[PDB]
């Protein structure tokens, strides 16, 4: 019985990042121990304290002195906030190593999220190992190493591109799908997201939460050793377990009503928190699912201008064909259940892989940060999903709403977009197996950790 190394962790964003980053420490344990260094702009949500709360012992939770955030622009993007906020956090987490430090422990690695590159030169200069953990696709992060060459070459917005881009290893992308930083390079969330980007080489190793099975193409590139270029860790798919076995409880309604539906007939519709649609956009959501054929299960939120502000009677018109659930749902638990066929989800990262995971076919729905450029590699990519096009307005039609549905659950493409993405979930469970090539890749990193 030695000692556990221990490993300090630095989030950036909210729930989305700290779920595989959880999933990321509960694999390595009892191995080592870890410590969430959260930075805040302010009392921490009570949904953060309460998973945080929830993980096991040995992945303790330090949320840091909250810094003050007024000074920066009250328009001021996501990625810039929380940038603003890591920055202004290290001398907290300078403290935070040294109380373990003196005491005796070995602070074996430094684990900084997407948007924590600030937090290697704390790591650097404490001769810990810093290592990225990249909680999107392996794609996005091609696009990361790439931004500082793509930024030397293109000079104007990259929605004013004709052709699309071209990442080392991915399919093309056009500028106005790529991710929402970038959009506008005027503002100070490009410049921070160049910053980080140039900052990826001073980690031992990023380590990203996708396998090759899911993304041949920009995985391998990433595996090519280059000088400047981290060594890249695919230890994906990193998803959260059901209620298969985190806790005994009585069967909730929404999952007795998929029992007596059919198998993969249910449409399992939810964009996620933080998904909220204009009251136009849900809307035309609202009609199709009214006038179609199709069995759903629709988690609603109220929209920015909630089962009482939907169209006239729509629960009259919707009633044991779909059933309407408000803000939250058991989302794992619907996609392992088989009476669910589809899932228009918003394509974050984490609710796509718990999609690929039990092989749902997507309705791949963007909306925010790297979303869209997700949509992009799994409708035409990987083939695995529909995409409803998107109308000069901002507003998705219920004509491509309804196309993608029916296409979907009906259909023949929807019949190849099925068996293709039977064979995603085959390979997911196979690189999390004894045998996978994820497996490998957490006990390397393991290793080097506990390594000298
Ligand atoms: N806010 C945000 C979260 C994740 C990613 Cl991958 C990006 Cl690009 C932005």
């Given at each position: 019985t030695a000692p556990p190394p221990h490993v300090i962790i630095v989030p950036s964003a909210g729930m989305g990042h700290l779920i595989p980053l959880a999933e990321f420490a509960k694999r390595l344990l009892p191995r080592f121990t870890f410590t969430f260094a959260v930075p805040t702009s302010g009392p921490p949500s009570s949904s953060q304290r309460d998973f945080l709360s929830s993980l096991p012992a040995s992945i303790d939770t330090s949320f840091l002195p909250e810094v003050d955030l007024s000074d920066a622009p009250s328009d001021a993007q996501i990625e810039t906030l929380m940038?603003?906020?890591?920055?202004?956090?290290?001398?907290?987490?300078?403290?935070?190593?040294?109380?373990?430090?003196?005491?005796?422990?070995?602070?074996?690695?430094?684990?900084?999220?997407?948007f924590?590159?600030?937090?290697?030169?704390?790591?650097?200069?404490?001769?810990?190992?810093?290592?990225?953990?990249?909680?999107?696709?392996?794609?996005?992060?091609?696009?990361?190493?790439?931004?500082?060459?793509?930024?030397?070459?293109?000079?104007?917005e990259f929605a004013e591109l004709s052709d699309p881009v071209q990442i080392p290893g991915c399919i093309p992308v056009h500028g106005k799908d790529l991710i929402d930083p970038v959009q506008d390079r005027k503002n100070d969330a490009y410049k921070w997201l160049l910053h980080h980007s140039k900052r990826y080489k001073l980690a031992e190793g990023?380590?990203?939460?996708?396998?090759?099975?899911?993304?041949?193409?920009?995985?391998?590139?990433?595996?090519?050793?280059?000088?400047?270029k981290p060594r890249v860790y695919p230890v994906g798919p990193l998803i959260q377990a059901g209620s298969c076995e985190k806790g005994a409880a009585a069967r909730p309604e929404c999952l007795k009503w998929l029992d007596?539906?059919?198998?993969?007939?249910?449409?399992?519709?939810?964009?996620?928190?933080?998904?909220?649609?204009?009251?136009?956009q849900q809307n035309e959501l609202a009609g199709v699912?009214?006038?179609?054929?199709?069995?759903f299960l629709w988690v609603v939120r109220p929209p920015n201008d909630p089962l009482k502000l939907l169209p006239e009677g729509f629960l009259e018109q919707t009633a044991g064909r779909g059933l309407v659930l408000p803000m939250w749902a058991p989302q794992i638990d619907v996609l392992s259940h088989e009476?669910?066929?589809?899932?228009?989800?918003?394509?974050?990262?984490?609710?796509?892989?718990?999609?690929?995971?039990?092989?749902?076919?997507?309705?791949?729905?963007?909306?925010?940060?790297?979303?869209?450029?997700?949509?992009?590699?799994?409708?035409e990519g990987l083939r695995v999903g529909l995409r409803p096009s998107v109308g000069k307005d901002g507003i998705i039609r219920g004509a491509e709403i309804a196309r993608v549905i029916g296409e979907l659950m009906e259909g023949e493409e929807g019949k190849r977009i099925r068996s293709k993405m039977q064979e995603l979930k085959?390979?997911?469970?196979?690189?999390?197996?004894?045998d996978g090539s994820s497996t490998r890749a957490l006990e390397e990193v393991a290793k080097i950790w506990e390594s000298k």
């Open positions: 940038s603003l906020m890591v920055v202004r956090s290290l001398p907290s987490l300078r403290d935070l190593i040294a109380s373990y430090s003196a005491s005796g422990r070995r602070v074996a690695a430094l684990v900084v999220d997407l924590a590159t600030d937090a290697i030169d704390v790591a650097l200069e404490l001769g810990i190992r810093p290592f990225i953990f990249f909680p999107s696709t392996a794609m996005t992060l091609s696009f990361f190493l790439h931004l500082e060459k793509l930024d030397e070459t293109v000079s104007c990023v380590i990203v939460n996708s396998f090759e099975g899911l993304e041949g193409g920009p995985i391998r590139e990433l595996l090519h050793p280059e000088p400047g007596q539906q059919p198998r993969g007939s249910v449409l399992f519709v939810n964009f996620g928190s933080g998904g909220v649609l204009s009251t136009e699912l009214a006038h179609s054929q199709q069995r009476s669910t066929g589809g899932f228009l989800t918003h394509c974050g990262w984490n609710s796509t892989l718990e999609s690929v995971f039990h092989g749902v076919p997507l309705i791949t729905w963007p909306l925010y940060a790297e979303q869209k450029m997700n949509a992009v590699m799994l409708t085959r390979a997911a469970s196979a690189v999390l197996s004894k």
